[PDB]
Amino acid sequence: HATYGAVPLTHSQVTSVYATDGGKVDELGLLELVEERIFSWKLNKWEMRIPPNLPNDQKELIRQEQENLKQILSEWRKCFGALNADILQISSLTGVPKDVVREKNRTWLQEEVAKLRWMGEVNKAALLRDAFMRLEAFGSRDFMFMERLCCIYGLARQGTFDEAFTNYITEDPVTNDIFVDERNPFKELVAHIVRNYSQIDIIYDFLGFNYSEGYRSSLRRYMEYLQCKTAENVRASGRLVTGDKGEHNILFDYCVSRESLVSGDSCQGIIDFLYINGNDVTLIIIASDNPWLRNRQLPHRRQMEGIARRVCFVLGIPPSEVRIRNLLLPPTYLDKGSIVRLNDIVFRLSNEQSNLLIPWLTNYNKELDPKDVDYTALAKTTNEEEWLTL
Amino acid sequence: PWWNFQTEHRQRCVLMYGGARTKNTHNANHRVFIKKYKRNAFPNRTRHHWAVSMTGVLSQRPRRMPWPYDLTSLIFNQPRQGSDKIGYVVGTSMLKTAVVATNHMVYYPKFNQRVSRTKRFFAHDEDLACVEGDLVHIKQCRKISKYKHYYVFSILEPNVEGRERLKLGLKAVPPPLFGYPVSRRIVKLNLTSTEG
Amino acid sequence: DIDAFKYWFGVKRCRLSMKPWALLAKAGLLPPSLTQNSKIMPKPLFDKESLMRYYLANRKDEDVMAREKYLNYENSMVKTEEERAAERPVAPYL
Amino acid sequence: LKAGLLGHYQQEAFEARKRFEESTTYPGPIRAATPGDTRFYSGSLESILHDTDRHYWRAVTDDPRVQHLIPLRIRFKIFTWVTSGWEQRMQVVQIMAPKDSTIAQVKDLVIVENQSPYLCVSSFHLAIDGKELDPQKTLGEYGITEQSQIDAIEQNDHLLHRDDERPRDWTVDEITAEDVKRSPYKEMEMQPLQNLAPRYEARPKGYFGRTYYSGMK
Amino acid sequence: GLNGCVETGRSRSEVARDLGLSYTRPLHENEKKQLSHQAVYYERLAKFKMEQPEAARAMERERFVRKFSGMFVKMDIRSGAPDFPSTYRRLLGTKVVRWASKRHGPN
Amino acid sequence: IPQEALHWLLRMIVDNFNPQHVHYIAAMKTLQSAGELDMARDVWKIMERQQTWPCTATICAYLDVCVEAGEKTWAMEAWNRYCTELKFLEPGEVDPKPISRVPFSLTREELLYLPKWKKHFDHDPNLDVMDLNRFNRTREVYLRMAQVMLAGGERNAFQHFFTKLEEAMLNKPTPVPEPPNPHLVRRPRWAPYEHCKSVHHSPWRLQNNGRALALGPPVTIEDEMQSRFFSNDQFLVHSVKEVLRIVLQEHKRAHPTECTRCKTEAFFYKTKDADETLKFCDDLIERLFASLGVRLSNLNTSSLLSTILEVFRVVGKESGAALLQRANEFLERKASLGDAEGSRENLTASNYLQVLSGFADESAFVYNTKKDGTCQYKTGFDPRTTMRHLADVVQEIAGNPHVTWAADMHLQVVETMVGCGTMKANDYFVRNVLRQFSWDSRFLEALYVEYRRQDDVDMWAELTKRALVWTARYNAPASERLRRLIEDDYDTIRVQTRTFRELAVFQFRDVEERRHSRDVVNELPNPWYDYVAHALPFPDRDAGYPDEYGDLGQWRAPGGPGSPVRGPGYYAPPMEGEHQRGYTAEWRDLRNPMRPPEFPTPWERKYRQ
Amino acid sequence: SRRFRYNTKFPALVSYNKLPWEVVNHETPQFHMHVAPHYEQLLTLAASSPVPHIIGSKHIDVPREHRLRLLPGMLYLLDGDTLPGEFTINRVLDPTALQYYGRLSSQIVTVEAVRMLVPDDLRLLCNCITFKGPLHLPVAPYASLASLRGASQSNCFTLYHFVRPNRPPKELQLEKYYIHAPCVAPLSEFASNSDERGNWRPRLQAPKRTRRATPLPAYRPPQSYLMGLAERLAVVPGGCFGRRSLMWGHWF
RNA sequence: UAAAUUAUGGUCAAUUGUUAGUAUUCAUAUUAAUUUUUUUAAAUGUUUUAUCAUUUUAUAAAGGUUUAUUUUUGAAAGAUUUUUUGUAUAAAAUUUUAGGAAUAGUUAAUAAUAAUUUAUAAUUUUGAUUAGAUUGUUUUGUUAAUGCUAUUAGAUGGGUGUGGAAAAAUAAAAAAAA
Ligand SMILES: [Mg+2]
Ligand SMILES: [Mg+2]
Ligand SMILES: [Mg+2]
C-alpha cells in the first residue's frame, strides 16, 4: 500500500528496478494471470496507493492517473466477463468444447443456427447468433493487448503495486494442500515489458495515461528517433536536432504551448515543434484543452509566409520550391490516425515502411474522443488544406 | 385516505391526554375594553393601551414564522437550527470578544414574502485577530459568559483597511457622526460665549 | 402492541398491573394473573420432604438444564455444523 | 447576507482557488503538527472531574504520546530457605526505561515498579561487572542495552523510605488513574467493565404508539 | 490561521496556536493596559496578603461569612440560570426588586 | 447476555454512525471473552460490509478469534484480503511512521464552491488506517497466522510463517511500541468522596477493599509486559510459548475426555498422539535454544517454562516430581548457557502451580466409578511417595518468600491431599485457605470425597453441614456439582441442599412441562408468543407519509419542530438553489395521483411499472 | 467569565481530617479496636515468612527534626520492654480497650502490657504491646520471629507502632503486611525429613455404611412472638452473617 | 430580385359519455355561539413500622410572565456483589399597545471559588427599559381562500436545607411494600 518511502518512478527507474538476466516466457499467459489477480481484488485495495509525502498538486495528478487506470481496468474486466459469458453460452448451446469456439467460423455458426431453427429453438438460435456476432469483436486473446500492457506499466510506474501480487495463501489444486507462493508474476511481466518494448513509455504517453507531464516529451523522443533512423548521421544539441547537411532534416523544440499561451492576452501563433524536411516546413502544434485558445494557437497565413521566408533566408532554400503547413495534434493523447498522418506528412514515410520501422504501430488502435467535436472539426479543416507555397 | 398533519397532531394529543380539545371555544364572545385613564394621559411614555390587544407569539395576525431557507442553510449543514452563522464584525470594544451581526429570514404568509432581520451575537476571539469589518463564520459552543455562547470558527474576509488603519495608529473604523437620541426633545447646540 | 410490550417487559423491565395482566392472559402473551383465582380449589400446601423426594425422583441433567436455560435466555439462533461449514469459505480465498 | 449572490460568489471562489493552485502551486510538503485541544465544545458545561483536556474524537495516536523505551532487567541477590539452609538466588525485575534516562532515573523506576516488599525494601545501587554506575550518567554513555547485566547491591543498615509520590501511570497527557497499582505496560486489554450497567433509551422521539404516520422527527 | 478545523472543532485561533502563527491586530493603549494590568494586580494582592496578615485574614473571614450566609448558596436551577433577571422576569417588581430591568445584553 | 455487544454495534450503525476500529476490537474481544466465536465472526462480517479496511490491531483481534475457533479458512481469507502487504521493519527506516493526514479543514474558497456532501465530515475509519498502522505490529500478525496454521494442521504454511517471523526477529530492529490510549473510557478524576470502609468492616470475615486487598488472589497471574513492549528476542520467546499454547489447545479440543480431572479412566493414561506432539514441542524448544545463544540468558522465560510444564503435564502424563525436575533442569541450563556461577533463578508462581497440578493429576481419581462406591484410581499409584513429594515441594515453596500463594495453588494442594487420602486435607483447608482466601466451591467439592471416608455417618454429616455453614459465611456459594454430590447421598445423610422455594418452583415447573410435552393440542406454534416481528425504530416500508407540503387553510408551513411539512402547499416566496430544487421537484408529494413519491436510486427502476 | 468555567457539580469538600466525628481518638477504645487485627495479622505473617525490616537491633534513630516527619507509620519489634525516651507513658488499664486484644492474646501470643507514648509536642503517638511467652502458632526456621529469643523459644518481646494522634482510621490501617503465607504444620508429617512417613495409611475408599445418620430431635416450633419473615425484612439468616435470600436457622 | 417545381397515387371527420382538483348566491347565512318560557348525577379516615420516634408515600398557591419557564436526576426500575454505578440544566427563529424614548447591583477580560483590578463597556428608533393587556408554538368558528376569529399544554428564590429531585399544607376519579 501507500508508504512513506514509496515515490513515483520514471521510465529509467522502472528499467533499473524491474530487470531480468534473461529467459523467455509466455507474455499472453502472464498478462492474463496478472489481470485475473487484479480482477480478484476488492475495491478496498485501491484505497491507500498514493504516497503521502508529496505536494498537493502532484498528489492530485497521481490520484487522477490512478483513477483512470482503475476505470480502464474495470472496463476491461467487464469486457472480459462478457466475452467469457458469451463463450460459455455458445458452448452450451452448440455442445462443442469451450476451446474451439474461438476457432469456429461463420459457416459453422450458420450450420448450428440452422440446426437450432430446425429443432424449433428460435430463441436459442437468435441468442447464439447474437453471441457469436458480438464475440467476433472481442474474442481475440490480445484484443486490447497494447492498452493492457500500458495499464500494467502504469501500475508499475506508480511504485505502490509491485508488492500487491505476492504473499497469497493458496491451495494446490493437485494435492489439496495449503502453501504461500512467493512467486510474483507482476515483476516478471513488467521486466519482460521493459526488456522487449523499448518504447513502452512512448506508447503509454501517447495513449493518454500520462496525466502529470502530458505526452510532448514522448512525442519529441518519437520524432527524434524517426529522424535519426532516417538520417543515420543525426547530431543533437539541446532542443535542436540537425542532420549533416545534404537533405535538410531539422527538428526544433520551440517551446511548450501549454505554458507559452497566456489567457486574457492577444498573441496569435505559438508552435511547439518545427520540422524541416527537404524544402518543406511543418509546424507541429499540440492543441489545448481550452477551446478558446486554439484560434490563438494556430498561426496566421501571414505568419506562415514569414516563417517560410525566414527559412529561405537562413537555409538558402530557393523561394520557388518552398512549402509550409500546420499539423494540429490532440491535446491529451495521440490517436492512430494522427500518428499515421504525422508519419505520412512530416517524415514522408508510407504506411508499409512505417510499420516495418515500428512494430507496435500496426497494433496501436487509439481513436479520437467522440466528445470533443470542436477539436475534430478544427483538425479536419487544418489537415485538409494544401501546402502554402513561397 | 391520506390524513393531514392535523390528524397526527390530534392523535398525539389523544395519546397524551384522554381525548382532544374539541369543545367549540366560543370565538364570537364580545370582548370589551373599559377605559380607566384620561383621554391622552395613559401611564406610559412609549406605547398607549386603548383597546383589546392581540395575544400569543405565533397567533399574531398577520402571521410571522421562521424561514429556514436562506444563505446559512444553503452553505452550512447545521446539526441544529442556528448552530452555524456567518456575519460581519461590528465591534471589538470588549477584550477577547467580537460582536457579530447576522441575518435570518422571517416569512409572512399573508403577503407571501420574506425579510432579512438582524441579530447581534457576542462571538469569542482568543488571540485578538478579529477586526471590525471582517466577514466571519461563527459556531455555537459552551457558555463562556453571561451573554457569550458563540465563537469565531474562521475569518472568511479580513478587513485590510481596518488592519492598515490600526497599523497606522488610527481606529479600525472611524466613529459615525450620527447615532441614538438622548431624548425626544431635539438636542440643540450651544454656541455661546462664556459671558453669555 | 407486541414488540413494544416485549421490549418494555424484558429489556426495560417495567411493572404490571392486574387488569392489563388479565387482558394479556387472554391475549396469550402472559399466563393467568395471580389474582385470577377460583374458589373451586384452595391454595396448595407445600411439604419440604415431599418436595425433596419429588426432586430426587425427577432431577434433570446438569448439561441438559444448562443448554435449556442457555437457549431460553441467551441466543437461540445457534448455528449447527452444517451452517458453520456453509459459512466457511471453500473457494480460492481472496 | 443576500442569498441571491451565492452562485456568483461560488464562481469567484472557484476562480480564485484555481488561480492560487496554478500560480502559487505547492512549495514542498509540510510536516503535520499534532492538533491541540479546543476550549469551545457544544452542550452544557462539564464538571472538573471529567476535564481530560480532550473534547473531540481522535482515533490515531499523536506524536507527543510516543516514547522510546528499552526493556531493562535488574537482578537482585535474594536468599531462599532450602531444606538445608539459606541459598543464594537471583530475582529479576523487568522495567521499561527511556533511552535518555540516567542511572538515577533507572533506579527510581526500579523502586517504583518493584511491586514487592522484598526487593527494594532497603537502599541499593546499580553496578555492572562490579563497577559502580555513576547515578548522574545516562544509559547512552555507559552503552547499556537489554543484553547488559545490571546488578543491584544493597545496604542493609540503610532503609529505603517510600518517598515516591509520582504515579506510575503518569505521562505527558496527565491522564492518571488513581488507585491503580498495575503498571501501564503490564496490563493492556479491552477488559469488560462490571461496575456500570448498560442503559437503553426510554424516552421516545416523536413516535409513541398507534400509527406511525410521519413519526414527528 | 484564518480557518477553523471542522474535524476537531478548533477555531482559527487554536489552529494558529498549533501552527505557531500569530494573528494579533495592532493593539491600542487601552487594550495593552487591559492585557498588562492583570499581573500587576495579582502581584499587588499577593504582596498585601504576605505583608498584612491580620487585615487579609479579617477580609477573607468576612467574605467567607457573607458567602456562607447568603440566602441562595444552593446550586439549584434558579441559581444555575445564566441570566436570572431575564429568565425569571415574572418575579421582578412584585417579589424581587434587585434588578430594575429584565434585559441587560443581546439575548 | 453476550448478544448485547453485537446488538449495540448494530444499534450504532443504525443510528447513522461509523463504528471505529476501537468499537470493533471491543466487540470482538467481549464476544471472545464470552465464548461467542460465531458472533465475533459476525462482527468481522459487519466491519467488512461497512467497507471498512481493518487496521493491524483489528487484524490481530480477528486472528485471535480465528486461532481460538480453530478455523484456518477464516484467517486465510483475512490474510488474502488485508494482510499480503504487511512487512517487517528494516534497519534503514524510521521506526515510528509520521502522521500523514492533516485534519480535515475547509478554506474560504472551498467552503463556498464545494457541495455539502464534500464539505461533510463524519469520522470515516478508512481515513485513519495509515495513521493507525504507523507502529508496525506485523510480527503479531505473523505469530497469529502461524498459530492458526498450526491449529489447522498446515505444517508447511506454519513452518513458512514461523521461519519468516524468526528471521525477522533475529535480524531486524525492534519497532517502537504504541503507547496506551487513555482517551477510550470516560473515567472521573480521583475519587470525589474519600469515605472508604475498612477491611475488617464485617466482624465475621475479612473482606477486600477498593484501596488494598486483604483476602489474597484466587488466580496466579504472570507479571510480564505486553507483546508490543517485548523485544525481538523476547517476542521470539513469546511466539514459541504461544505456539506451544496453541498445541495444547488443539490437543484438548481433540481429546476433551482426556483432560478433565475426574471424568473417567481415560484421563490417567496418554493418548496415541502424545509422542508426536511431545517430539514436535521438544524440537521447537531446541530450535529456539539453538537460534538464541548467550542472549537467551537475559530474557524472561517464566511463561515459556510454565507452558512447557503444562504441555508435559497434559499432553504427556508426567509426574509432579518429573515436572519439577524439568523446570530445575531448564533453569540450570539457562544459567549454564549464560555462563553464570551460583546465580540461578527460581520457579515462579505459575511454574509451581503447574507442578502442583501435575501432583493433583497423579492423585486424581474417578468418583464412584459409576458403581456407587469403590472410587477407581490410577493403576500403580503410590500415595506415600506422592504425598512425600507434595510435602517437600510445598515446604520448598513456603521457604521461598518471593512466591505469592493463591487459591488455585491451595486448591491443587487440597486436591492432592484428598486423592492421597491423608485425612488431613480438611485441616489444611481450615488452616490455610478458609479464613484468608476467597476460595470457591471446588474446595468443598473435593473435601466432600474426604468427608465421605469418615468412619461414622454422624461425623460425615457434621462435616458436610459445617462445610455448608462455611459457604454461607465466607460468601462462597455452593456450586451445582457440590450440591448434587451432597444430594446423591441423601438416603444416607438426609441433608438438604435445595431451598424450599426452589423445590416448590421446580415441582410445578417440571409437572407443567411434562404435561405440555405429552399434550399434542398445544404443540402448535403461537405467533404472539414465539417471536418479535419488528424491532427497528422505523417501519420497513413506505406507507406514504410524510407529505412535506401544506394544504388549504394551513398557514404554518414549515411546521418546524415535530412537523414534517417543509413548505406551503401551493405558492411560496422565491427560493434559491437546492431549496428551490427540493420545493419544486424533489420533496415528497402525497396528493400526487399519477405516482407516489419515488424511491432513491437504484430502488426506483425496478418499480417503474 | 469566571462563573462559566465549570458547572457546580462535585465541589471541593472538607477533608475528613478536620471533621471530629471522622477521626479516631487514641483514648477511646476504637483506636485499639482498629489496630489489634493488624497486629495479629502481622504476627501471623511474621511467624511464617521473613519480613525484612520488622525486627531491628535497636530503636530507629533519626534526628529530632525528621522524627515527626518519618516516624508515623513505622512498626517494628524488639526484645524486652524498653521504651523510647521523650515519651510520656500511659498504660491501658481500661477493659473496654483491652478486650480487642483478647483474640491476639489467646491465639497468637499472650499479651502482657499495652502502653501509649505521647511525645512532648503531642503530635507523634507510639503504641507499645509487650507479649509474654512463646508463640502459640508454629514458627518456621526461616520465619522472622525465629530471631527473637522470647518469641520462638525474660521471654518478653515488644511491638512498637508509631502513628499520629488525631487522624482518620485509614492512617492507622496497615495493609502492606496482608501477605498470606502457608503453614506447613499439617504437611510436616509426610515430609521426607520427618520420621513419621511410614505411620499413616492412605484411606482411598470410603468404608461401607450399614446405618444412616442419627435422626434429629423432633422439631419444636417457637412460642414467643416473632418479629416476622426475616427474608422479607432483609435480615441475614441470623442477624449475623449469610445472605437474605438463602434463609436458614431463623426459628424454622 | 427567384419568379408558383405538380400521377390530387388515397379522402373516408368527430362522439362510446372514464377522473392529475381551492372555486365565489353581499348576506336574508338549511353557519357557529350567548340570550325567553328556571337541566342532573361520585365521595372525603392514606397506609405501614422497631411506639411519645423512625421507615414509604414530589407542580394544577397562580399568578400577571411577549429577547420569558428549560430541565427526572445519586431514589425506584435493577438482575448472585464496583466501590459511588451513571455527562439532566445549555442554544437559534417566531413575541401585544391610536397619540413611541432612553434603559441600568449594569458588558467583557481576569492568577479573582467568595473579582478592592483593567477597558474607548452593555441595552436600544431594525422600536429597548418601565407601565397596560394576555398562560407561548398548525387543536375553535367561518370562507372559494397561506384571510379573519378562538384556546386553563393548567409550568419557579425567605415555610422546614430535608431529599436522588421542592413542587411540600383545597380538591381533581388514583392501588401505595402478605
Ligand atoms: Mg406587564
Ligand atoms: Mg425567544
Ligand atoms: Mg439504584
Ligand SMILES: [Mg+2]
Ligand atoms: Mg417588542
